[PDB]
């Protein structure tokens, strides 16, 4: 996935803090306490660096709320569109803030509603489209979830 | 029967010039600004919330409030959260928001603010006595269950 690096390589110092997209139905006052976008991302990297086993979804979101100011239900839907892949977590925020959009509509690993609605298509073109966007691996995994 | 909370519900919409200043385009959609008066908005709102919803139908209600009253979905969602899901407090939320030029209304029974929620978990007996006087024991316990 190293060809995707560009999606992670957004400089936080280019994003004035707080971003306009950062409202009160998503972030708590701990969030706005940060002094720069970089300060927030660094705390995000630190939190998620922690060792969370697949079973500790609950503690994760709590720690996220507690340490970075991200509301707990917001973390939950994100991890959900990330197929639970914590590594793509900073990518969500950097793209959300960079392009002021929640969620980012054209980012590999970030499954949108329409992406999900496209999983239910027998159209060879529709399947191909999803593979081209997220990758074979992310595709096959997203199916399993969809098939449950 | 009777309740001294009725002063929060019986604000005369004709006394609120339309559209109210606090009603911004980040909160409301074109449909809303097309209502002819505050009362027209309130009657549509009353229609919608007096519809039939199962405890599990927050999503539909929020969609119905967008389509029928022009309230943006993220806003309707924050509101429901402030109201611990009590539909019948929706009209009260808007009447006071519009009347007092505040969002959320900070001193209204049934409308839980950030400060309210912080006092609830502070287990400082004086702050909690104030919450009980504001919202009542019934809402208090409901909110406690809201944090379980």
């Amino acid at each position: 996935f190293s060809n995707e690096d560009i999606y992670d390589n957004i400089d936080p110092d280019t994003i004035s803090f707080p971003p306009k997209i950062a409202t009160t139905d998503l972030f708590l006052p701990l969030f706005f306490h940060f002094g720069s976008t970089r300060q927030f991302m660094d705390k995000l990297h630190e939190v998620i660096s922690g060792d969370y086993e697949p079973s500790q979804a609950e503690k994760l979101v709590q720690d996220l709320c507690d340490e970075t100011g991200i509301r707990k239900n917001f973390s939950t839907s994100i991890l959900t569109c990330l197929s639970g892949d914590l590594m793509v977590f900073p990518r969500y925020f950097l793209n959300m803030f960079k392009d002021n959009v929640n969620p980012p509509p054209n980012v590999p690993g970030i499954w949108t509603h329409d992406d999900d609605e496209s999983l239910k298509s027998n159209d060879q073109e529709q399947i191909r489209k999803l593979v081209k966007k997220h990758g074979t691996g992310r595709m096959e995994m997203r199916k399993r979830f969809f098939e449950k | 029967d009777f309740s001294n909370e009725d002063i929060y519900d019986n604000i005369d919409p004709d006394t609120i010039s339309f559209p109210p200043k606090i009603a911004t385009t980040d909160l409301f959609l074109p449909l809303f600004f097309h209502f002819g008066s505050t009362r027209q908005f309130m009657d549509k709102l009353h229609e919608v919330i007096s519809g039939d919803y199962e405890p599990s139908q927050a999503e539909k209600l929020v969609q119905d409030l967008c389509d029928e009253t022009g309230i943006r979905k993220n806003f309707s969602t924050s509101i429901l959260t402030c109201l611990s899901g009590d539909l019948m407090v929706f009209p009260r939320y808007f009447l006071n928001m519009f009347k007092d030029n505040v969002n959320p209304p900070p001193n209204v029974p049934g409308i839980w603010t950030h400060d309210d929620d912080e006092s609830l978990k502070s287990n400082d007996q004086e702050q909690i006595r104030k919450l009980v006087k504001k919202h009542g024991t019934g809402r208090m316990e409901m909110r406690k269950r809201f944090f379980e």
Binding site: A57, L60, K72, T80, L86, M87 | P55, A58, E59, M142
Partner: peptide, 20 residues
């Protein structure tokens, strides 16, 4: 570092608001 999707998919339903 991946979170079990089951735990998430239900933690979502868990955090949704219930109509009173």
């Amino acid at each position: 570092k991946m979170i079990d999707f089951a735990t998430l998919s239900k933690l979502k339903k868990k955090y949704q608001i219930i109509l009173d």
